[PDB]
Design a protein around this nucleic acid. Structure first.
Lengths: 142, 207, 7, 36, 54
RNA sequence: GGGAUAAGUGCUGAAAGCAUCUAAGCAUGAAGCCCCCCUCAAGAUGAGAUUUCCCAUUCCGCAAGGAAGUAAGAUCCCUGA
RNA sequence: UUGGCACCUCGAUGUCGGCUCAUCGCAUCCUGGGGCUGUAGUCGGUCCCAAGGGUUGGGCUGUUCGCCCAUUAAAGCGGUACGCGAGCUGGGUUCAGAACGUCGUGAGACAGUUCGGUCCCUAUCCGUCGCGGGCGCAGGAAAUUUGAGAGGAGCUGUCCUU
C-alpha cells in the first residue's frame, strides 16, 4: 500500500568540504546521505541514496591527542601480521582511505553497504574529476 | 643506472693477472635496441624498453611488427623494461652494446631459476629428516601443521609443491672480461637459470 | 589407566 | 630510579609533573625519581 | 579418512563439471572419409598423404 | 643510508616576575616502526596505465537484441624440453 | 606449579618423555640505545626503552628437571589440550607370564624393584602448499608495465690500527 521506489530513483551529486570539521562528525552525515535518510522516498532494500564527493581530505582534523594515540590496524591472515600506524601518518600520506574507513564503519554491512560505498568519492584537495556530473555544493547541518 | 639483457651460454674458468682461478659465466647480451621510452607525463614513470634476439617474420605477430616499426628494427623475442635509467641518454632505436660495462664493475644479475618440479618439503624448504631406524616410520615428511587451539593451519606452513621457475636476483657480481667483438660478458660467480635462458644484467645499487 | 589398546 | 612512591629525599628536591608523570629533580643525581 | 557428511546432489554435479571428455581432432580424409582423426592413418581407406599404405 | 620515534639528553620559555624538558614552539636519540635489499602482485569487482594491429559484414528481429561467415589473433593435432 | 570445586566429555576428549614442524607474550640470555653508581679504565651491580634476529654438542638416567665435560655473544623464561601419536617412536607408566623384599592362614596386594609384552584408517568439508579450466574487467587481440596490498631477509665472533 505505501510507495516503494525501484528503478525510478534520481541520484544527485553533492560536494562536501572537510577543511574545518572532524573525521568524525561529518562522516555520520555523509553515511546518512549515502543511505538516503534525507529523502522521503527512502526504501531500505533498493539504495535510494545519492552520490557524494569529499574534497580537502588532507585538511581534516580530530580533537584531543588522537594524532599520536589513535592506531589503525590492518591484520593479515598470517601469524604475527598485525601492522599498525598512527592517525598522523595516515593523514599525512593518504587520508582518503582514512575517510573511507570511517564511512565503511558507519555504513551498514551487506551487499547494499558495498553498493553505497561505491557512490563515495574522496580526493586530496581541492579539485575533483567529476565536473561533468555537475555536482552541487552541500552544506552540513551541524 | 645502466643495464643490458641477454642469453647465457654456460660456465667456464679464467685466470687473470695472477695464478688465481675464477669461475666465469658467459653471457651473450648484445645488441639490444631501444624500442620505447616511458615518460612521466604520459606513462607516469621513467623507463626504457630493450629488445633482444630478433626472430623470423613467421614467428612475429602484426602487433609485434607494428610495435617495432617506430624503432626501425626487426621484431625481437625478449622485451623488458629498465627502471630507472638516466633519462634520457638513449634515443629510440639506438643499439645498446656490451661496451657500457667495463671489466672491473659491480653488477646485479637476475633471471628465472631452473625448474625442479613438484618436490617434497625436505628439498623445497630444507627441513630436517626423520630417523630411518629404532622403530621409526617417519622420514621425508613436512611435520605437524601446528597447534590444536586455532582449529586450523596457519598461513605460511611450509609444504611440498613446485620448486623453481621463479625470478632470482644475485647481487654484487663482478665482470671478469668484456668481449666487444663476439658480444660476450664474463661474470664472476654463479648465475641463476638454465642454459640459453634470458639473463638481465643491471648495474648494482652503489654503495 | 586409559590405555589405547582397541582391537 | 623508577618507583611509584616518588618523594623528596632531601630539602633540595623539587617535585615536578613533566609529561603527566610525577618527577623529582635535584642537584644530587641520586635523588632523581620518576613514576610511570 | 571418513566422510563426515554425505555429498549433496548439487556439489556432486559441480564436481562433475570437468569430468566430460573432448571431441577428438577429427578432420576430412582427402581420399574417402568420413572422417579421419589428425596425424593418423585412416581406418577406412588405409591411406596417408596420399598413398595406399594400409 | 633517509623520515617520524621510545627510554634518555636538551634549547627558548611562562603558569608561579625566580626556577623548570612542556603546558605552546624547536631539536637529538635504538638491532623496535615506515622505506631503501629481494619476490608475488589490477578477481586492487576500486578489475588501473602505455605501445601496436583488426575493422566496422550478411540475415532476422520495426526498439532492445539474436544467428552465420570472418579480420587481427588463438586453439584442436603433431615434433620435443 | 601444588591445590580446592566437580561445570563439559564414561553409546571413548589417547594420557609422560623424545623426533619433525612451528607460532605467540615479555616478567630480556645476548646483541642495540640510556639513567644512577661506593662507575679511575677493562669487567661489573641495579633500574628504564626495546621481541628485529639468534639463543649448543655430548656423558648419566624412560626421564622433564638436575649434575658434570667442552664451547659460545648467550646457551632466557613461559602459553598454544603441561602445542603437535587420522604426523612418528613406546623406553616409563598402564593388561594377560614370571621372579625379589614386605604384608596377608589363604586366594592375592604393593607410587616398592626387575625381565618380556599387537600403536588401525583409501581425506568428505573447512583449513594449508602448488597447478589448471571458465566468466568478468562495456569491441576483439599481442606485448610491456605502475603499485593498493602481501611475503621473504633482519644474527653476530676474532684480529690490526687509532
Amino acid at each position: 500500500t505505501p510507495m516503494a521506489n525501484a528503478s525510478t530513483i534520481e541520484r544527485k551529486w553533492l560536494v562536501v568540504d572537510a577543511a574545518g570539521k572532524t573525521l568524525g562528525r561529518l562522516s555520520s552525515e555523509v553515511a546518512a546521505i549515502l543511505r538516503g535518510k534525507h529523502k522521503p522516498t527512502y526504501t531500505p532494500h533498493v539504495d535510494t541514496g545519492d552520490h557524494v564527493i569529499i574534497i580537502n581530505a588532507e585538511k581534516i582534523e580530530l580533537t584531543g591527542k588522537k594524532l599520536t594515540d589513535k592506531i589503525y590496524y590492518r591484520h593479515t591472515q598470517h601469524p604475527g601480521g598485525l601492522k599498525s600506524r598512527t592517525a598522523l601518518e595516515m593523514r599525512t600520506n593518504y587520508p582518503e582511505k582514512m575517510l573511507e574507513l570511517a564511512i565503511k564503519g558507519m555504513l551498514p554491512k551487506g551487499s547494499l553497504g558495498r553498493q553505497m560505498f561505491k557512490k563515495l568519492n574522496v580526493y586530496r584537495g581541492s579539485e575533483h574529476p567529476h565536473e561533468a556530473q555537475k555536482p552541487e555544493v552541500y552544506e552540513l547541518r551541524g | 643506472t645502466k643495464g643490458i639483457l641477454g642469453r647465457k651460454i654456460g660456465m667456464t674458468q679464467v685466470f687473470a693477472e695472477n695464478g688465481d682461478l675464477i669461475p666465469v659465466t658467459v653471457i651473450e647480451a648484445a645488441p639490444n635496441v631501444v624500442l620505447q621510452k616511458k615518460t612521466a607525463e604520459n606513462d607516469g614513470y621513467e623507463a626504457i624498453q630493450l629488445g633482444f634476439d630478433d626472430k623470423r617474420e613467421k614467428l612475429s605477430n602484426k602487433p609485434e611488427k607494428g610495435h617495432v616499426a617506430k624503432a626501425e628494427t626487426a621484431p625481437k623475442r625478449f622485451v623488458k623494461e629498465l627502471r630507472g635509467v638516466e633519462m634520457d641518454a638513449y634515443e629510440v632505436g639506438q643499439e645498446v652494446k656490451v661496451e657500457i660495462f667495463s671489466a672491473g664493475e659491480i653488477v646485479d644479475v637476475t633471471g628465472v631459476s631452473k625448474g625442479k618440479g613438484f618436490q617434497g618439503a625436505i628439498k623445497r624448504h630444507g627441513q630436517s629428516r626423520g630417523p630411518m631406524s629404532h622403530g621409526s616410520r617417519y622420514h621425508r615428511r613436512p611435520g605437524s601443521m601446528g597447534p590444536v587451539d586455532p582449529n586450523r593451519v596457519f598461513k605460511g606452513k611450509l609444504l611440498p609443491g613446485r620448486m623453481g621457475g621463479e625470478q632470482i636476483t644475485v647481487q654484487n657480481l663482478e665482470i671478469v672480461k668484456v668481449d666487444a667483438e663476439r658480444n660476450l660478458l664474463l661474470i664472476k660467480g654463479n648465475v641463476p637459470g638454465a642454459k640459453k635462458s634470458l639473463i638481465t644484467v643491471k648495474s648494482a645499487v652503489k654503495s | 589407566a586409559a590405555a589405547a589398546a582397541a582391537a | 630510579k623508577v618507583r611509584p612512591s616518588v618523594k623528596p629525599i632531601c630539602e633540595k628536591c623539587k617535585v615536578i609533573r613533566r609529561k603527566g608523570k610525577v618527577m623529582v629533580i635535584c642537584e644530587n643525581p641520586k635523588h632523581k625519581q620518576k613514576q610511570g | 579418512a571418513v566422510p563426515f557428511r554425505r555429498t549433496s546432489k548439487m556439489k556432486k554435479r559441480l564436481r562433475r563439471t570437468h569430468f566430460k571428455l573432448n571431441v577428438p581432432g577429427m578432420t576430412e580424409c582427402p581420399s574417402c572419409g568420413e572422417m579421419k582423426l589428425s596425424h593418423r592413418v585412416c581406418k577406412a581407406c588405409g591411406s596417408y598423404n596420399g598413398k595406399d599404405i594400409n
